[PDB]
Structure 1
Amino acid sequence: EDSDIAFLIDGSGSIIPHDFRRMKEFVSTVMEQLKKSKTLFSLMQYSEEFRIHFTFKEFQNNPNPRSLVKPITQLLGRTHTATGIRKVVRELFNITNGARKNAFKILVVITDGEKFGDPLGYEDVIPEADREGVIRYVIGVGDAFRSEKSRQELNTIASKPPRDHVFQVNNFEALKTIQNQLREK
């Protein structure tokens, strides 16, 4: 089977630079320790404006993740989470960027759980990921769990069940649930 892995990081100002560094480094480790067959990686940084830091084509041609992740900055915008997702499903999972049909499609949403200024809601874009069939792993950060409505924003983003998908970034055993879900898949 075909392992298509996408990565969506928040860059909003609410992301303190230390949270942000953890994100970039955790992603790079996620890919690194996901060194395994037939896995493809693409990334976009999301805030109030979006910019895909690498596509799948650019990844099959460049396997070194550290080379892909170093140049990434913070955006310091607003937080258009909902809009970011249609940018993931409509662009990253397009055949034009490398997307293969009948592949295991996973989205890694890495944010603190605070959408703001987004004109789009979730009731259009979440059922979209499900009608397209993308299994959504969410990685909350900093104080993504201090508040109540943030952490539920996460389960709102994460596919069900959220206990199996919602994880903190510093936790090192966020991969093994998925690293393993493929070993006989």
Structure 2
Amino acid sequence: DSDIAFLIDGSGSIIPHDFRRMKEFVSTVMEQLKKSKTLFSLMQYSEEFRIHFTFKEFQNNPNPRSLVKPITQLLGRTHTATGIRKVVRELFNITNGARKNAFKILVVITDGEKFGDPLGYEDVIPEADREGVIRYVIGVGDAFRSEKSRQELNTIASKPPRDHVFQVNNFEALKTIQNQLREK
């Protein structure tokens, strides 16, 4: 009933430790929200964009641990805006495995700083909101310590941003999101 896609920031500002946590988090999410009618997709980004598995591939091999294990860090700059636009056009495409009528949910796990991205959020948010793509932001590193990073997260997360922005170190957040996922 729902199409969930994962977008993880793997720039140079991403410490291997936290990148690992991202992978662990994603796997735990796919192992916790393992429903008979739920597919997953994951695309990592930096200056480039690498899809590791589409909704179709996950439908062929429903092994989260096996799909997240070979995932390597890209490194480089950050393209959160350019990434969001690509996610709503390629990741959520029927050809890749996206279903019709099903809800669109995008989980964005960025470093907090979209540096080097030629596109702004104003160029991609109005697009993601039209296609009906719910946004959930998970902050890592110092994303909650800086003002610029905090507001950025609130610009990606669907309003109200407070109820859509969680910490990567917040384990209870998973139960919280899964809760709101009932009042979709």
Identify the TM-score tier after normalising by the shorter chain. over 0.9
Partner of 1:69: 68
Q: Structure 1: which 5+ residue stretches go unaligned?
A: none
Question: What is the CA distance between 1:62 and its match in structure 2?
Answer: 1.1
Deviations 1:153-175 (A, max 9, x none): 00011111111110111111122
Secondary structure in 1 matching 2:72: coil
Distance 2:7 2:128 in 1: 14
Secondary structure in 1 matching 2:151: helix
Distance 2:165 2:36 in 1: 25
Q: Once superposed, what is the RMSD of the aligned Cα atoms?
A: 1.2
Do the aligned residues in 1 keep the contact of 2:47 with 2:77 (CA within 8 Å)? yes
Secondary structure in 1 matching 2:39: strand
Distance 2:36 2:113 in 1: 34
Distance 1:108 1:97 in 2: 18
TM-score by length of 1: 0.95
- Among the aligned pairs, what percent are the same residue? 100
Secondary structure in 2 matching 1:122: coil
Runs of 4+ aligned residues of structure 1 deviating over 6 Å after TM superposition are none
Deviations 1:75-104 (A, max 9, x none): 111101100111100001000011111111
Distance 1:47 1:59 in 2: 23
- Superposed counterparts of 1:78-97, under 5 Å: 78-97=77-96
Distance 1:29 1:62 in 2: 16
Partner of 1:38: 37
Question: What is the CA distance between 1:184 and its match in structure 2?
Answer: 6.7
Distance 1:19 1:54 in 2: 21
Do the aligned residues in 1 keep the contact of 2:12 with 2:75 (CA within 8 Å)? yes
Distance 1:35 1:184 in 2: 18
- Count, aligned residues: 184
Distance 1:184 1:141 in 2: 26
Deviations 1:101-142 (A, max 9, x none): 111110000012110111111112111110001110000001
Do the aligned residues in 1 keep the contact of 2:11 with 2:76 (CA within 8 Å)? yes
Distance 1:139 1:181 in 2: 15
Question: What is the CA distance between 1:8 and its match in structure 2?
Answer: 0.2
In the alignment, does 2:161 pair up with 1:171? no
